Amino acid sequence: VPLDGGRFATSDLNDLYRRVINRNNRLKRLLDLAAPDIIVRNEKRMLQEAVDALLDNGRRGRAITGSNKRPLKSLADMIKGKQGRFRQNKRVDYSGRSVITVGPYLRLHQCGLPKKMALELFKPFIYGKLELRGLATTIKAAKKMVEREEAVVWDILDEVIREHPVLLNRAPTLHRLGIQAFEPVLIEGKAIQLHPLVCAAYNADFDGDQMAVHVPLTLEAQLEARALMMSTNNILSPANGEPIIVPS
């Protein structure tokens, strides 16, 4: 890919494939020019070190990169463990994060969610209403009504969030109680409020700890966030029958 400015950003295989097709391309020549068996016999020995620097580079002299002083990254150094698999076990759309705070007026099953965030995760839902209630002729003219922050969308956004559970989850998620759904309530600010009883399940002090907030999208996925995962089903920690919502 070409970077911005003139430079390119090559992957580290085009530095290794060029080194096999070059050495292989020469060894095709020595068998026509008919060199002695001290050179061509040194060619195959030199090719075979470059097909085996492609598969798993490092079980040899470690053919470090040119124009730089770090070892190249071969194919079998792309599946190998980063402690997590190359594939899935993944980043994710419809997310966010902010500084949690207290909000001790909430019921047990609802967390705050600032206006400036919820207007950004629930965008493709809001586009549904503004073209369903006729308030926008076409979708390109609903994208300019949410950017203006017109005073109509603040009353459509609050009906997209009627019973739509979200998924607060803290960073080092030890046990299954570290992910719990909640029913948002729109506040004003930029801190995700959170009922004080639950803050001992996440193990969250309120001194700067942040918390992502996902969004169950489909229709079978906002029932699994309301039957299985809701915050009023987990009043008993799975490790033992003792409660987990003890007033702290």
Partner: peptide
């Protein structure tokens, strides 16, 4: 005499 040498440049000169 093949003292576990690996890199060819050791083997070319040898």
């Amino acid at each position: 005499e093949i003292g576990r040498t690996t890199d060819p440049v050791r083997m070319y000169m040898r």
